Design a protein around this ligand. Sequence first.
Ligand SMILES: *[C@@H]1O[C@H](CO)[C@@H](O[C@@H]2O[C@H](CO)[C@@H](O[C@@H]3O[C@H](CO)[C@@H](O)[C@H](O)[C@@H]3O)[C@H](O)[C@H]2NC(C)=O)[C@H](O)[C@H]1NC(C)=O
Lengths: 211, 232
Amino acid sequence: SVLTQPASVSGSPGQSITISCTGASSDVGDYNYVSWYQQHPGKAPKLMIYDVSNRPSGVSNRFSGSKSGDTASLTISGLQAEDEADYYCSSYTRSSSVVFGGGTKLTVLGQPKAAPSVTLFPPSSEELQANKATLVCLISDFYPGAVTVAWKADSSPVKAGVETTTPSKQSNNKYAASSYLSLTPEQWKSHRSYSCQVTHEGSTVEKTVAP
Amino acid sequence: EVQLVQSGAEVKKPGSSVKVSCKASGGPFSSYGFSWVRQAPGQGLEWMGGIIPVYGTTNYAQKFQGRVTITADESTSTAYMELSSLKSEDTAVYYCARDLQRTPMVDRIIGSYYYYNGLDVWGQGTTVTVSSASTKGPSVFPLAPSSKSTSGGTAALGCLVKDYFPEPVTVSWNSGALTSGVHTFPAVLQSSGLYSLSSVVTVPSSSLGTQTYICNVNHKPSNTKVDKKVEP
Ligand SMILES: *[C@@H]1O[C@H](CO)[C@@H](O[C@@H]2O[C@H](CO)[C@@H](O[C@@H]3O[C@H](CO)[C@@H](O)[C@H](O)[C@@H]3O)[C@H](O)[C@H]2NC(C)=O)[C@H](O)[C@H]1NC(C)=O
């Protein structure tokens, strides 16, 4: 048995939002051991709803649960900025003894945009003496954390030797990411220049280095 | 309230096994169901198994049947999860979480019996990295600043920490003196299985050629410590 969950839901502050588990309701005379969890990045999940309409002590009454047919729903009223986290549903069945849903990433909208600050470094002389070359493209202070990177050498796109990280939230609620281009010292000084283009929300910022 | 304390991080080669402890530093332990849930980085929660220590019963998910084993120690109030035949897809954060209500009284105990109301108390998690790569110290290369001391504004310089394993590495600047403008980026996992990251400082351009900039790379698993001077 599988519990399906929307991959992403988004709302504004003050808005109400409903996530929906659409899995286990089965086995007619059996009961419903359905529960919900909230998980902030780098922390353990927190039980928000169990037993489907019940809520444990300390959890804000803005969270409530319901179920109709084979679909359970978690309703969050008066969306606050701290509610932005990942949400999971769970259920106990005779067949399978718990199933955590795929998860739903809740985004609280309204926050201002931010273009990425990009810094590009050429390979060091000390690295070229070791017969290696690596281009370092560093992406900082962009909001939200969605971005894609394309490398080029004299207007020609290059795919070989590109290692790009996933975005990560900084301490200032903005995101960061880095991309690395590996080259032999021949490919570096034979070409005219190298560029790292960072496209963010349709706006592309570019930086270029050359030997 | 109840606290679940888990063992430290673990790194394993494929085909080996790992055992994670879960010490219930509170009251509940005996008559309470304990579950083990893992979460791959950037993925959803996945339940592996559960145990009820008072009844000596365990229940395992069909995906992990045969290579997972959950045991309990009623004396020290500690739970254990052992996963064998480790594959690279098993790299995840492994949590242990107690249930919310005391187990009901079962007169006819099934050997696979388990109950689930909700996991309200969770442990801090245990990171288990399953790779096949060997421990390797990183090569540290400077990232020379592009702009000059007369170009005005601000300049950027840094260091490249390439081809190391495993995580983590720490990068300071000027022995911890320079902490402003420092941005150490998360590492990338290459196809070779080795990590590579960079750390850079945004410095005033007028300080180039005047203030010495040195990055301090420290990779404890390989006992590697490199001090690299970055020059224009
Ligand atoms: C009665 O039966 C229980 C089992 O239901 C026995 O409990 C077991 O107690 C021993 C210690 O007395 C536990 O062993 C310990 O293992 C840890 C490693 O996990 C080790 O570091 C310790 O030094 C110790 O050897 C054992 O885990 C535990 N087993 C279970 C399933 O709880 C109990 O000893 C029995 N008592 C009598 C008087 O027969």
